[PDB]
Each structure stands twice: as structure tokens, then as C-alpha cells.
Curated annotation (Swiss-Prot):
Protein source organism: Homo sapiens (Human)
Protein name (record): Thrombospondin-1
Family under the similarity heading: Belongs to the thrombospondin family.
Bridged cysteine pairs (disulfide): C14-C51, C18-C56, C29-C41, C71-C108, C75-C113, C86-C98
Inducers of expression: Expression is induced by PGE2, S.aureus and lipopolysaccharide. Induced in arteries and lung parenchyma following injury or stress. Expression in vasculature, including arteries, increases in normal aging.
Residues of the whole record sequence present: 434 to 546 of 1170
Domain called TSP type-1: residue spans: 2-57, 59-113
Tissues in which the UniProt entry reports expression: Expressed by platelets (at protein level). Expressed by monocyte-derived immature and mature dendritic cells (at protein level).
């Protein structure tokens, strides 16, 4: 009794919901399975195909902070600024916006005036 392949199983769904992945389907050497010294089934027991979905969301990421602006003062109470860019990367395909402020403030040179 030589082995015989069962019918293919239904194709699975895409391995991913976005971007590229694969759909798989399987067979069993059980229709009939091989007996002792009978020929085993010839071929593949699994078949992986490829599926392509829409691009995955790209969440925003902050770029480097700009250098601190020079202090508005040399003694008592200064305020210097600093800025950011949400373009490393820029949000795309429904990705989340960067979290946080685009600009930063801080007191400086607050000392003996
Ligand atoms: C599965 O992957 C996530 C990241 C989103 O792209 C969903 O829309 C998709 O179903
Ligand atoms: C700037 O502030 C003035 C008042 C002086 O104290 C300078 O020495 C400082 O750089």
C-alpha cells in the first residue's frame, strides 16, 4: 500500500494584516498512509504562498533637539528655547503622532546678577 495525499486543507489567512506575509495550506500522507515498505507520498506537505496587504502605519518619531537658544540674560533670570521636529520618521498611513512638545523652555544663568 503506497501512500496517497489527502486533499489540501483550506488556505489560511494572511500572516499579516499589513505589509507582506504568506498564506499556508497543508496535506497529510494519510489517504492512504503508506504501509510497511510501501512508497511514501511524493511532494510537499505544506504550501506557503504570498499575500500583500496595505502598508503598515508608521508612527512619528522625534528628530534631534536643536541646540539651546542663547540665554536671554547673563545673571538673574534667563529663558532659553529649544525646538524639535516630528519627522524621524513623519507619521504615515495612520501612524501615531509624536508624543510631547515641539518646543522646550528653561530658565538659565539664574545666578548672582
Ligand atoms: C494589522 O497590523 C496592524 C499594525 C494594523 O496595520 C492593522 O490595520 C492590521 O489589521
Ligand atoms: C550680563 O548681565 C550684565 C548685567 C553683567 O552682569 C554681565 O557681566 C553679564 O554677562
Amino acid at each position: 500500500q503506497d501512500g496517497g495525499w489527502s486533499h489540501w486543507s483550506p488556505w489560511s489567512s494572511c500572516s499579516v494584516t499589513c505589509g507582506d506575509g504568506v498564506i499556508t495550506r497543508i496535506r497529510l500522507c494519510n489517504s492512504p498512509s503508506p504501509q510497511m515498505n510501501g512508497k511514501p507520498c511524493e511532494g510537499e506537505a505544506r504550501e506557503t504562498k504570498a499575500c500583500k496587504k496595505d502598508a503598515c502605519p508608521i508612527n512619528g518619531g522625534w528628530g534631534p533637539w536643536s541646540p539651546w537658544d542663547i540665554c536671554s540674560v547673563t545673571c538673574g533670570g534667563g529663558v532659553q528655547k529649544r525646538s524639535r521636529l516630528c519627522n524621524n520618521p513623519t507619521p504615515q498611513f495612520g501612524g501615531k503622532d509624536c508624543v510631547g512638545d515641539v518646543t522646550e523652555n528653561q530658565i538659565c544663568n539664574k545666578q548672582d546678577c
